[PDB]
Amino acid sequence: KEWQENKSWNAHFTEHKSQGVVVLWNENKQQGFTNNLKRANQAFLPASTFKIPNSLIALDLGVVKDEHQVFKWDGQTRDIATWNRDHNLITAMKYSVVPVYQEFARQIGEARMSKMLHAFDYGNEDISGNVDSFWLDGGIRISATEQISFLRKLYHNKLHVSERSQRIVKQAMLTEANGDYIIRAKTGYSTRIEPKIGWWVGWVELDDNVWFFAMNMDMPTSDGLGLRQAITKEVLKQEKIIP
Amino acid sequence: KEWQENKSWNAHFTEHKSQGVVVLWNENKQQGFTNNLKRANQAFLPASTFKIPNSLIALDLGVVKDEHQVFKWDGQTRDIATWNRDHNLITAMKYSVVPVYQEFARQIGEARMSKMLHAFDYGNEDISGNVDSFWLDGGIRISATEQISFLRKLYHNKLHVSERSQRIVKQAMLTEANGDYIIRAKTGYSTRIEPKIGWWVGWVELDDNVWFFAMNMDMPTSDGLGLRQAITKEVLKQEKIIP
Amino acid sequence: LYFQGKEWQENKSWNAHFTEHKSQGVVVLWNENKQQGFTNNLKRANQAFLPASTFKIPNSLIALDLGVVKDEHQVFKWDGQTRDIATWNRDHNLITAMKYSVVPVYQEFARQIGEARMSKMLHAFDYGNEDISGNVDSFWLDGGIRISATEQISFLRKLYHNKLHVSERSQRIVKQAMLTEANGDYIIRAKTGYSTRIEPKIGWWVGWVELDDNVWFFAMNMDMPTSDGLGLRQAITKEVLKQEKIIP
Amino acid sequence: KEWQENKSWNAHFTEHKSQGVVVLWNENKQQGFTNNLKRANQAFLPASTFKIPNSLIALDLGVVKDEHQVFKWDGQTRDIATWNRDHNLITAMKYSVVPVYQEFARQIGEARMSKMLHAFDYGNEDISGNVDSFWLDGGIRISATEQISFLRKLYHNKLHVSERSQRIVKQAMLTEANGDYIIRAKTGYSTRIEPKIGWWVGWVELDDNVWFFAMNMDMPTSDGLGLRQAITKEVLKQEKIIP
Ligand SMILES: C[C@@H](O)[C@@H](C(=O)O)[C@H]1CC(SCCNC=N)=C(C(=O)O)N1
Ligand SMILES: C[C@@H](O)[C@@H](C(=O)O)[C@H]1CC(SCCNC=N)=C(C(=O)O)N1
Ligand SMILES: C[C@@H](O)[C@@H](C(=O)O)[C@H]1CC(SCCNC=N)=C(C(=O)O)N1
Ligand SMILES: [Br-]
Ligand SMILES: [Br-]
Ligand SMILES: [Br-]
Ligand SMILES: [Br-]
Ligand SMILES: [Br-]
Ligand SMILES: [Br-]
Ligand SMILES: [Br-]
Ligand SMILES: [Br-]
């Protein structure tokens, strides 16, 4: 059975007075698991999870030369302190530095952005709105199952952009590594249109398998942001994917 | 003297654990009063105070036919419940309905928007960024002192746009009226660049004088938004402008 | 509750608001969206009285349309004659003249308009019985002109919709000058009147309540033997508006 | 000052009843630090640290097609349980799977192995001994300072192999990652020729700097192997490189 619902994971959302969805994909078995098949297939603004395709396109087009190229702060103080400095691709993805990616999107332009998202089969492929803000308050929407389909292509270097572009973005996605697992992932927090949601999408590399994941959860305030990773890890532990 | 600093108004900011400026202009005496000349001249994003020039331009170019024309809710559920309904110019200005004004700005377009703000001598006249979001996160900046200069021209029908455009916007600015005074004004809340500030700009019509006002204050959360009107009214009452 | 399709529905319960103040009169309401009227007294709702200072609305419109008044800033110099109402004994503009019901300013407008244009304009406006018989500068106080509360509403609806046979500008300036009350829940544009020259002495308040998604037109009059009860015009109207859930 | 001696670091060695050297290189400042200048320049058998150059050569010559290619266990039960199974480049590096790298070395051959170590300026460049064991019991010798020189070239993609080969080996070196730092490194344990020593070589990636490191310590028994990483992290902590 390709897709199975496991409502026992709702206890992790309940425990934290939260509502949301975790989707897992066992790459070896080609099987999916979620607490909520309906919500797994509901589309939301990608917010900063869009930094994964945006990075790939920026690299492929040479808007980003490499992961060391410096993107100057515009000197506007914003409310995430780590944003108010020069960045490279690694630090811009680590700290979700929106203004750096807004500059990439302007240099990419609407025609190339649209073509690339169609070829990626990325969400509804709709860039309507401002080319520098559409993933925040424009027409683009993606479901957790659609995030998994896209991430599997990236994992296997199967996107049409260069192998090099794909390797550099996976390096930039690096979030955690230890003796048991590697996590490559991207957070997002969509606030400009309801419902306000938190994302975490990516994969867990084990010695002998890869588990893809995409989660979103209701996030009425920034107070709950750490629950994005905390709830995913509680599900990964329950399923014995990580110790 | 054209400008005088009255630091006693700081008592009103301090009582509300707040920081900001109130600027008053006595039209009859051509004299200004502020608690803080320095902050009175600091330029900030106008945010929803931009709905005053945006309304004028939209009416002058016929983007808005009249104050009854209905602008249909686009069906995207947003944060402010009153935005999720149809609006005319009157209700759109009352509830600060951004999406309505974003549509006005797109129809106006960057060339006419830029030229109109130059004719108005409006703040730094800089519309850099997205034509539909520059007053939220683009290049435009205006100080409390510069808001007064603009509002005086609107009050006297001295802006280059039609008298009709000016009359309809002043109708739309109506905020409060009783047997003692009329307030025409517009709130704003700038959150996308630091420092987050609240605005209230407009004027008090008396039988035999007009007092222009422009106030802004630090607004780290939405909890303090009522302080924009409350602190301004404390100053107006101290100065015997209103009971 | 009320019935659909009905033109005018009587609600005698509002008489309680008059009786409380040892008074009697009529409130008429018109729901613009629903095209339905309500009154405590179907007979008095339709009784035609001298308009007295409510005439300042059409008088204002005609004076502006003909250029007798240039704009709402033009100063009308006090003629030097000390009258009973202190607020009349000073310079006025259209805004302050309408707020303080400054009869002498409007008498001067009426003489400049003159009988032929005043008559033509009231016919174009379908205003009350359209009769200006009497002194060109006092007919709305002691001449032949008569208007009911329902006819005040008819006229006011045309003004609200800029449908009177004068410039849009004239209509916008007069609606500005009618501004009486505003807050985050409602706006009232209205004009008071006090007919004292011909019995029975009555008080008026006519205008409308602007809501986000509707307009409620109103016209009230009440017996007013002395100026002591003039504040009851607004007070009783607000009791009715509160009862009908039009204002909180 | 090219190299500074900091003997206060010896406290990390004595607290662990151990003797050895840590060498750090601050890439931004082009300055080195060590607890023992003379041992920093002492050349030892590289043992499994040789897996870094061997991986690069194997990739560039196509012995390894990519990091997914499976290297079938030869069926020989060996002392380290994790070696008794199939491996790819990632797991062969993680578990230091000598037999996989011995097969790489036979496929590379003496002539190409020699030319590549000359091209890399690697240690004494001397491969004399068994083509499949010279890094364990042959003539090759490298100091901690020479490990850092070699690693700086790999970090900057300056070795005379392709950018792709360098990017794949740096992926395979991934050891630890969190919100504070990333460590790419390789352990070694030289037991075949006295003196028995342990290695750890690699670097710490920070947001704004890279700290290269090479440590070796006396290792009479396998009981102290965890001290390779533990003593290095005690130094990084003392220098405020990691929290
Ligand atoms: C809020 C929005 O800018 C968000 C996004 O684009 O998804 C940024 C800010 C954040 S969380 C900071 C909280 N800010 C709330 N406005 C992240 C993240 O953690 O990935 N990305
Ligand atoms: C938030 C921003 O759009 C702001 C503006 O553009 O000035 C909106 C929201 C608000 S306050 C509503 C509560 N805050 C939500 N951001 C107002 C205002 O009062 O003028 N306008
Ligand atoms: C009395 C008459 O002039 C009257 C009118 O024209 O309607 C004036 C006086 C007044 S109230 C003054 C009370 N004394 C009246 N004699 C008003 C009003 O309330 O609109 N207007
Ligand atoms: Br392409
Ligand atoms: Br590559
Ligand atoms: Br990596
Ligand atoms: Br056009
Ligand atoms: Br001016
Ligand atoms: Br007009
Ligand atoms: Br008005
Ligand atoms: Br080892």
Author numbering:
A (entry chain BBB), B (entry chain AAA), D (entry chain CCC): 23 to 265
C (entry chain DDD): 18 to 265
The publication says:
To reveal the effect of chloride on imipenem hydrolysis, we sought to obtain a complex structure of OXA-48 in the presence of halides and imipenem. We added 500 mM NaBr and 32 mM imipenem to the apo OXA-48WT crystal and observed a clear Br– anomalous signal overlapping with the density of imipenem, indicating that Br– and imipenem compete for binding to R250 (1.53 Å resolution). R250 has been proposed to play an important role in catalysis by binding to the carboxylate of the substrates. Through mutagenesis and molecular docking, we established that R250 not only is important for substrate binding but also is the target for ion pair-induced enzyme inhibition by chloride. To further explore whether the binding of halides at R250 is a key driving force for the formation of the inactive acyl intermediate, we performed ITC analysis and showed that the OXA-48R250A variant no longer responds to the presence of chloride with biphasic features but the nonconserved OXA-48R214A variant still does. These data indicate that the binding of chloride to R250 is essential for chloride-induced biphasic kinetics. After supplementation of chloride, binding of chloride wedged between the imipenem intermediate and R250 results in progressive rate retardation from the accumulation of the inactive intermediate formed during catalysis until a new active–inactive equilibrium is established to deliver the slower steady-state kinetics observed.
Among these carbapenemases, OXA-48-like enzymes are widely disseminated and plasmid-encoded, and antibiotic resistance in OXA-48-producing Enterobacterales can lead to high clinical mortality rates. Though the catalytic mechanism of OXA-48 is known, the molecular origin of its biphasic kinetics has been elusive. The partial inactivation of several OXA carbapenemases during turnover has been observed in the literature. It has been proposed that it is a result of the decarbamylation of the N-carbamylated catalytic lysine residue (KCX), which acts as a general base and is critical for the acylation and deacylation steps of the reaction. Our data and analysis thereof show that chloride ion acts as a Janus effector: it delivers allosteric activation by binding at the dimeric enzyme interface while independently causing the inhibition of steady-state catalytic activity by misorientation of a reactive intermediate by ion pairing with R250 in the active site.
